[PDB]
Each structure stands twice: as C-alpha cells, then as structure tokens.
Amino acid sequence: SKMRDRLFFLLSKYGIRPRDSIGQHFLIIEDVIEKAIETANVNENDVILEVGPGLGFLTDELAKRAKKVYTIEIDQKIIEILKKEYSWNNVKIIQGDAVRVEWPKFNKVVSAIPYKISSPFTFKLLKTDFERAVVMYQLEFALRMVAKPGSRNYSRLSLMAQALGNVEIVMKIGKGAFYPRPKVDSALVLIEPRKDKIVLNENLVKALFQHRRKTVPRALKDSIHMLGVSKDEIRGIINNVPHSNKRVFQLYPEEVKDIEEYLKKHGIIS
Ligand SMILES: NC(=[NH2+])NCCC[C@H](N)C(=O)O
Ligand SMILES: O=S([O-])[O-]
Ligand SMILES: O=S([O-])[O-]
Ligand SMILES: O=S([O-])[O-]
Ligand SMILES: O=S([O-])[O-]
Ligand SMILES: O=S([O-])[O-]
Ligand SMILES: [Zn+2]
Ligand SMILES: [Zn+2]
Ligand SMILES: [Zn+2]
Ligand SMILES: [Zn+2]
C-alpha cells in the first residue's frame, strides 16, 4: 500500500526500530482510519484524546477534522519525529505513560490502544466524562469487554464495561492492517457512557474478581481474610450475603451493587 511505504520511509529516515517494544504495531490502512473517524463523528467542535500517536497516521486524520487533539506518547524520539514531520496547529503532544499521566479535558477518544495498556486504559476511560470513544483493541480483549455475565470470558473488565458503558464491536480488523503483521485480529470498539451508571466500589470488585470461578461467599471470605481480618469475625455476616448462590463470574453489576450495600451496612465498607 501507499501507507506501508510512508512508514518504511519514516522508520529509516530517523533510523528507528520496526518494533520499539513488543506490542508495537502501526495501523497502515487508510480506510480503517477513515472508518474509526466516521464512527466517532469527529467534527469541528470536538476535542479528541488519542493514545500512542506512533507515526501520526491517525493523528493527522484527527487534526484535519477536530478542533483540538491531545495525543499521549511515552517515547521522546517519536515525539521529535511528530514535531518535525507534521505541521498541525491544533495538536498537543503529551510525553508520558497514558495510564499514569493526568488526562486533559476531552469529549471524544479515537485511538489504537496498544495491547499492553488495554486493560488499565479502559478502566481509566470508563471512570471519565466523555461523549464517545472509538478504540481499536485486539479481538480477544474486545470480546472480553462485551462478554455476558456467566460466560467463560466474563471478568472484571466485562463487569465494569457493562456497569459503566454501552460497548459495541463495530467491525473486525484483519492482521493485514498493521506493520508488523500481528498474529491475531483486532476490533473497532465503540463505547458510550451509560446514562444510568452502576457505580461500584473498586476494592470490592477487585476482591471478588481476584478468583472469579469462586462462589461469592468463598471469594469474600478469602479476600478480607488476606487484607488482615479474622475469619471468625466475618463468617456469619458473609454467609448471609445476597446472591450467595452464584460464582463471581455470573454477577450482573446490579448484584455486585447489592453486595456492596449489604457490606456497607454491616460495617465491612465505609
Ligand atoms: N455501529 C454503530 N455506529 N453503533 C452506534 C451506536 C450508537 C450509540 N448507542 C448512541 O446511542 O449514540
Ligand atoms: O503485540 S503484537 O506483537 O502481537
Ligand atoms: O496534514 S498532515 O499531513 O500535517
Ligand atoms: O480476519 S482474520 O481472518 O484476519
Ligand atoms: O477480630 S476483630 O477484627 O473484630
Ligand atoms: O437484584 S438486586 O437488585 O436486589
Ligand atoms: Zn509509543
Ligand atoms: Zn487468552
Ligand atoms: Zn483463582
Ligand atoms: Zn442473585
């Protein structure tokens, strides 16, 4: 393609690495970019967050259409390339770990998300105010995000995504769309916040989903015991917990929330 060539050319121009680390794969199909941007309805008033600008192929399309783009990049060498190779008036590049740095105020996210940060980035995204996020993930991860309570891949991510978002896989994306060619497919994922969020206590969810195949009482007995509290002191309170006849992997957010309120009331949470 025309975009694979431009990549090869910039990599060699700056003498930099095909792969800087292992989850480094650049998107090289203009039509997958155009499809993400049109799925996000990027317009002249939107303020976009992008993570992992890479060589700026997506960033360039975003800057054409949006009013402001913030793009977070860990590697200072990539940043110096983006500054030299593009002329944008409306892009603010942020040096940092996208998981660790404080985020600017934005209404939309449009980004390929490196697989290494897919889980933490998604958890952080779901806790922020935004209209719309269109993001590319590995397919397996994307399928975890839309997994249904009681399915074999339902996990803390699945729960928090259901609790806090509407999540739609827009399309599969082939391995042929990145260089280097990955060994698994990706997916274009749309996220909108729920109008009716189910805000769950993070510590509780973590406690429960540590070992998600466990029944709900066993999960809570083991995790609070390990926090450092006696078994004898909580046995009976925890035996009467709502939804006790489920394994953690089967809980709807609504059922987690009841457990939260039951435990708040019994002094286990404040
Ligand atoms: N394939 C898609 N574009 N799906 C769009 C879903 C729209 C979204 N649920 C909304 O309320 O705006
Ligand atoms: O992360 S890539 O190497 O599949
Ligand atoms: O339009 S971009 O290539 O600066
Ligand atoms: O869509 S997968 O077959 O590359
Ligand atoms: O034994 S104490 O934690 O009530
Ligand atoms: O099912 S819970 O909301 O009582
Ligand atoms: Zn990077
Ligand atoms: Zn797996
Ligand atoms: Zn386990
Ligand atoms: Zn139940």
- Cα 212–Cα 217–Cα 222 angle in degrees, nearest 5: 70
- Ligand 5 center–CA 209 separation, angstroms: 24
Q: At what angle do helices 253-265 and 156-164 cross, to 10 degrees?
A: 90
**Strand extents, DSSP E, 113-175:** 132-138, 165-173
Tokens of 233: 């002191």
Which residue has the least CA distance to atom 4 on ligand 6? 258
Q: Which helix (H) or strand (E) holds 70?
A: strand 68-73
Tokens of 123: 């958890």
Q: Are strands 132-138 and 186-193 parallel, antiparallel or unpaired?
A: antiparallel
Question: Distance between CA 66 and CA 47 in Å, rounded?
Answer: 7
- Ligand 7 center–CA 57 separation, angstroms: 13
Question: Distance between CA 155 and CA 151 in Å, rounded?
Answer: 9
Question: Distance between CA 259 and CA 268 in Å, rounded?
Answer: 11
φ, ψ of residue 188 in degrees (nearest 5): -90, 115
Cis peptide before 180 (omega within 30 of 0): yes
Tokens of 165: 């978002």
Residue of 137, 262, 253 whose CA lies nearest to 205: 253
CATH of 202-265, one of 2.102.10.10, 3.90.220.20, 1.10.8.100, 3.40.50.300: 1.10.8.100
Question: Distance between CA 269 and CA 220 in Å, rounded?
Answer: 12
- Ligand 10 center–CA 261 separation, angstroms: 14
Q: Name the H helices within the chain.
A: 2-13, 30-40, 57-65, 76-85, 118-126, 139-145, 156-164, 202-209, 216-227, 231-239, 253-265
**Strand extents, DSSP E, 79-232:** 91-95, 108-112, 132-138, 165-173, 178-179, 186-193
Q: What is the CA radius of gyration of the chain?
A: 21
Question: Distance between CA 165 and CA 194 in Å, rounded?
Answer: 5
The answer to whether 157 and 122 have CB atoms below 8 angstroms apart is yes
Question: Distance between CA 172 and CA 141 in Å, rounded?
Answer: 12
**Residue 47 burial class via C-beta count within 10 angstroms: exposed 0-12, middle 13-18, buried 19 and up:** middle
Domain 2-193 annotated CATH 3.40.50.2020: no
The answer to whether 140 and 184 have CB atoms below 8 angstroms apart is yes
172, 192, 196, best to mutate for ligand 1 pocket (most atoms within 8 Å of CB): 192
The answer to whether 167 and 191 have CB atoms below 8 angstroms apart is yes
End-to-end CA distance of the chain: give it in Å, rounded. 57
φ, ψ of residue 136 in degrees (nearest 5): -105, 135
Question: Distance between CA 61 and CA 50 in Å, rounded?
Answer: 12
Question: Distance between CA 214 and CA 157 in Å, rounded?
Answer: 17
Question: Distance between CA 44 and CA 258 in Å, rounded?
Answer: 43
Strand partners, 156: none
Domain ranges of the chain: 2-193, 202-265
Report CA-CA distances (Å) from 48 to 71, 163, 232.
8, 24, 52
Residue of 170, 162, 105, 112 whose CA lies nearest to 131: 105
